[PDB]
Design a binder for this molecule. Structure first.
Ligand SMILES: *[NH2+]CCCC[C@H](N)C(=O)O
Ligand SMILES: N[C@@H](CCCC[NH3+])C(=O)O
Lengths: 680, 681
């Protein structure tokens, strides 16, 4: 039988010229690739943006392999053609509003979208045909041969695709005109390259209904026709994400770790590690330091370039020897392990659980944030939101169950030093989704927690397809269908539909969360602040014999905020590798320093100047790519901002006395970055 | 035959207790009246507001007189009963959007609402029954007898009134629940008192938009039926109008609505045959005016504006720099120079822009520059000729007197006038006293009423509104939402005199301030203005060691600001209605407590609306504003008007040092006061 890799492709949006793109990373944490005129990868990316400051699309190369794992191309003996059919769709406008973990069936049927009352997006549209038309679906496109190109355009929808849909005409805010979901190409030997959207994000309100973006996902079909006209067919999936603004920095739990974990616990991917008959990991499984543990430590060690998480420093200091498996070092390994949060169970209404605990202790001397130190998958809504009393809460991050099992085996001394055998997972499969966020997912960046649900897969790393080209040709896509509920596979648009519509809202808010740590069932509460003030006046320096009566009055103010983080609260990151927050300035020449208004080497806010959600929707592409300036020298990283469109931004230095009224404060100033709409 | 006075009553909104009211002024520029328990007027008003800072309603007393001009009351010998029926309504939500002079048929049929394509308010409602239901109409109420009271309430609509309408349920913004248009009472002798609304303004859309908004302004018909001992009866009619508060009742408008009715009367109903020839349509140049009756009030009114606006260029028109009562030849050149500084009236012809009311100054030659008179906005200083998809939108930039006032001023100038008492005009004092306290000009749209009042077709005679149909017709049909009384010419319905005004009226009040008026292009009031600033930044570094140099750096940046409709320069700062919506007024608190709360010393001129920083705040907090009043009223001829009764406690205050704005701490020797409303109080 044939196989296509990667099993889940990953492309990234870009607004540069349609013909100006990079190719996929070839490993987790790898840079994307420049290419030659044959569309073969050459060197790692030189610049992420074009000269005009537009972000280049990143495309995914897919390859097809025969029974003995040899690659099939148009040059293979006995191959006369290879035809790729890709069907991408965006179902976001047709899906439910995002309400954290509501709708996630891993918590049981009582957490279904219907049982939780989650409203549909664009809720005034209630007939099925009206819901279907909210989907962006241009039908499938096909590509085959040497150096082919075809757009997934509203202008070349096949005649056989009876139900296309898209936001038509001139949109009233953001991007005006939707045109394309991306481009399919082949290289010089017939391999597929899928390129995604252009960063379109527009709608007809200011508010939020009737909005769209050009994120998409869907099916990949490959038909290889042999010289005698027989054929074989094999499938994969494809996902488009917004730009990876720090591609060398890897998420502690990636989506590859997610697929792997789902695989181990549900598809017998690693029989030695987990006993599928009983539903437990095997305590005799021996982990491997370099394969299983080291990546966690390395990933933790790079968050400092995009966030302030210094409390994690002890987990990569090598204050003791992480490679020493002896009894003498066991107390040390166990102490390291015991600082990681165990996983919550997935039971509705159970709040007092390890992911609601912030610190090791609150006794002075014994205070450390537990690990990894980041938000969990619901630090936003309390138990009592949305007219529920048992809304699922998950305040703080944990590793996935498989990572954590393997870490425990390390802690126990059940691990080796030296080479391990690879798991039965292709490296091409890990290289795509290993660059996507795995946790937390609220909703996340590329994908959300449907990817944790084994019912969407036909085997580890492989998305199950619902139906086929001939079905969708006649019927179109099914707007209300939940692949997690039906269990019979995914439709185009299913992997990305749950994310924010438009994505730049995920991006604007993927920063930090201020998370309560005193009441397990509470994230936010109403806060009433009453300030009662008595003003008393007296007059003096009066002549002898003169007096004037004092005067006094009382005033009060009452401020009510319906939903604010309950104190005491902890400053917690969301997705530092995918949405940086605290970064170093990198302009080393006078011109870049004048334009950026900053010296090099200073830590500042990554998004400075993008002061509103509407600005992010329009100017996302102006932001920097965080990159290792010392990449040639392994082990001595120096990550700074590169390629920020500094000219977009204006700048004012406000003296502190401007705010306070005290001119002595003007010895200190506050830098303010912003975007003036009136600039040319 | 009976007659009812006033012909057109005027009441004013108030949010104090329903039982806490003052009665109508008795003369033009008169204070309203306190009253006794019989509801008879006593002495002029003490406080305009109650102790809680809520404005007291002003009610209108109506009286009915017999064929001898003798007043009839329940105490009159041959009188068995007097029964009053008042039908007030608010048609504002069912009328057209206000678009300055569009719809005004005095400019010809080509200026009709339909020819001009003016849209309806709440334009999504198009069936006649749905338009009708936008009207606030609770039917008529009747009152008779000694000390009666009946509310114009949603809870006492007569069963015979088949189509009442009003905004039901809870409104989403501003006032939540509509309940009443006002109160009818009788006094101890059976006279009518009409009190109007309570200041309700609410709607279902956000004004920060403005569809499905309502206020409790109203107007409508008054019917009096007098029944005699023998059970015979006679009937007579009047009209009634409710306006927002008069915040400076002692200060009179240069042209009042009494002047409007008078002018309309002279020109169209033969009210004064010796002044105007109705067969040829011209004034009579041999009419001899009277200084005290005709001229002096203009001069006096001009002289009061200084208490509420900065109009110092008008000072020469009341200085007595020469003798205004000298009608001799030797003084004619002076009287003529005075008259010639007044704007003549524009002709109401579409497309004719180069006319006297587009002219600001006597000239722009140094030494010969004076703003023409009266110096104020006209009835369209807002929209240009090319607005609203039109090419010949009617413009009228600057104020003129009315045609009658100006005729009489010219008779003065020519020396055709008397000193001494005059013949009164055949107009009751009781008719001038009501509407003489309303704005007559300009009307864009105005305050109480707008330019329909200038149209003779709504009148059956001078000062008398013509009634369309009758009580039975409205019992069955309700009111006619689309009907223009000015187009049909067969009379007014309840709601017709106020429906054109802003909905809610607090928009008219928020904007009745000043206008920056272009005076270079007669067809233009506003234009788009594009300001492009192109900036080259250049850097050089110096004081470097010997042999060291670094290159200069430079770059270029630009901003392009586009405002779509702003006054076209050069422009002139022009008032709207200083008497009715004050702008520059004197602070009035003479004791320490009032000064601490106000944050100001007494005697300082400051902005009247300070702290009301948005339209939405005006809609909520109109009633906090001051009444401008003569603190020296006991001493005739020595006025001293200041704010009184401002609800200072509503407002917060910040003193901003100028260096907070500029970045230069040396500028901190100077500060700017900023008043505002913190909703979290
Ligand atoms: N995946 C990130 C969502 C951010 C949530 C936001 N700060 C909130 O409190 O609503
Ligand atoms: N200032 C307003 C009009 C004033 C309305 C007064 N009667 C404008 O430019 O629209």
């Amino acid at each position: 039988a044939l196989s296509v890799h990667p099993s889940i492709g990953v492309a990234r949006l870009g607004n540069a010229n349609t013909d100006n793109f990079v190719l996929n990373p070839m490993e987790i944490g790898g840079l994307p690739y420049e290419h030659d005129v044959d569309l073969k990868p050459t060197t790692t990316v030189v610049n992420f943006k074009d000269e005009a400051g537009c972000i280049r699309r990143q495309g995914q190369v897919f390859k097809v392999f025969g029974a003995s794992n040899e690659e099939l191309t148009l040059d293979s003996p006995n191959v006369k053609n290879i035809e790729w059919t890709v069907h991408l769709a965006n179902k976001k406008a047709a899906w439910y509003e995002f309400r954290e973990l509501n709708g996630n069936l891993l918590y049981g049927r009582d957490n279904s979208y219907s049982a939780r009352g989650v409203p549909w997006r664009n809720a005034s549209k209630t007939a099925s045909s009206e819901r279907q038309s909210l989907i962006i679906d241009l039908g499938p496109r096909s590509v085959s041969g040497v150096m082919a190109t075809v757009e997934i355009s509203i202008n070349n929808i096949p005649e056989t695709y009876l139900h296309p849909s898209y936001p038509s005409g001139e949109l009233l805010q953001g991007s005006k005109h939707f045109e394309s979901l991306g481009t399919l190409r082949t290289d010089s030997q017939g391999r597929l390259i899928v390129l995604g959207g252009y960063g379109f994000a527009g709608g007809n309100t200011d508010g939020g209904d009737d909005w769209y973006d050009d994120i998409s996902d869907g099916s990949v079909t490959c038909v290889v026709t042999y010289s005698d006209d027989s054929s074989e067919t094999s499938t994969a999936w494809m996902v488009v994400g917004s730009p990876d603004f720090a591609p060398e920095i890897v998420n502690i739990s990636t989506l590859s770790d997610t697929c792997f974990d789902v695989g181990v616990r549900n598809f017998d991917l690693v029989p030695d590690m987990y006993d599928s008959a009983t539903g437990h990991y095997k305590s005799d499984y021996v982990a491997n330091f370099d394969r299983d543990i080291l990546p966690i430590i390395q990933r933790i060690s790079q968050y400092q370039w995009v966030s302030n998480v210094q409390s994690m420093s002890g987990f990569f200091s090598f204050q003791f020897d992480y490679r020493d498996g002896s009894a003498a070092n066991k107390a040390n390994r166990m102490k390291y392990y015991n600082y990681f949060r165990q996983l919550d169970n997935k039971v509705i209404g159970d709040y007092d659980q390890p992911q609601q605990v912030l610190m090791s202790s609150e006794v002075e001397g014994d205070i450390l944030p537990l690990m990894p130190m980041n938000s969990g998958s619901n630090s936003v809504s309390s138990s009592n939101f949305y007219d529920l009393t048992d809304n699922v809460v998950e305040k703080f991050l944990a590793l996935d169950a498989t990572q954590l099992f393997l870490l425990g085996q390390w802690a126990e001394g059940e691990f080796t030093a030296g080479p391990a055998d690879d798991y039965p997972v292709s490296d091409m499969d890990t290289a795509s989704i290993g660059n996507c966020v795995g946790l937390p997912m609220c909703p996340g960046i590329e994908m959300t927690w449907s990817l944790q649900n084994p019912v969407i897969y036909k085997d580890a790393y492989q998305i199950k397809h619902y139906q086929d080209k001939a079905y969708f040709d006649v019927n179109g896509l099914t707007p209300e269908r939940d692949e997690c509920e039906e269990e019979t596979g995914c439709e185009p648009g299913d992997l990305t539909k749950r994310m924010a519509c438009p994505w730049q809202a995920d991006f604007f808010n993927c920063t930090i969360q201020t998370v309560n740590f005193s009441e397990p069932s509470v994230n936010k509460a109403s806060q009433t602040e009453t300030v009662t003030s008595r003003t008393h006046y007296e007059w003096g320096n009066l002549p002898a014999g003169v007096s004037v009566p004092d005067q006094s009055s009382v005033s009060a103010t009452k401020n009510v905020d319906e939903k604010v983080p309950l104190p005491p609260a902890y400053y917690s990151y969301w997705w530092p590798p995918q949405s940086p927050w605290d970064v170093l300035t990198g302009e080393l020449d006078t011109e870049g320093q004048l334009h950026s208004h900053l010296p090099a080497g200073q830590q500042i806010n990554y998004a400075r100047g993008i002061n509103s959600y509407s600005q992010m929707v329009e100017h996302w592409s102006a932001l920097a790519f965080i990159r290792d300036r010392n990449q040639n020298n392994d082990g001595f990283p120096f990550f700074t901002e590169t390629e920020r469109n500094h000219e977009l931004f204006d700048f004012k230095e406000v003296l502190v006395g401007q705010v306070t009224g005290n001119s002595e404060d003007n010895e200190t100033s506050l830098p303010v970055f912003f975007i003036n709409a009136n600039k040319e």
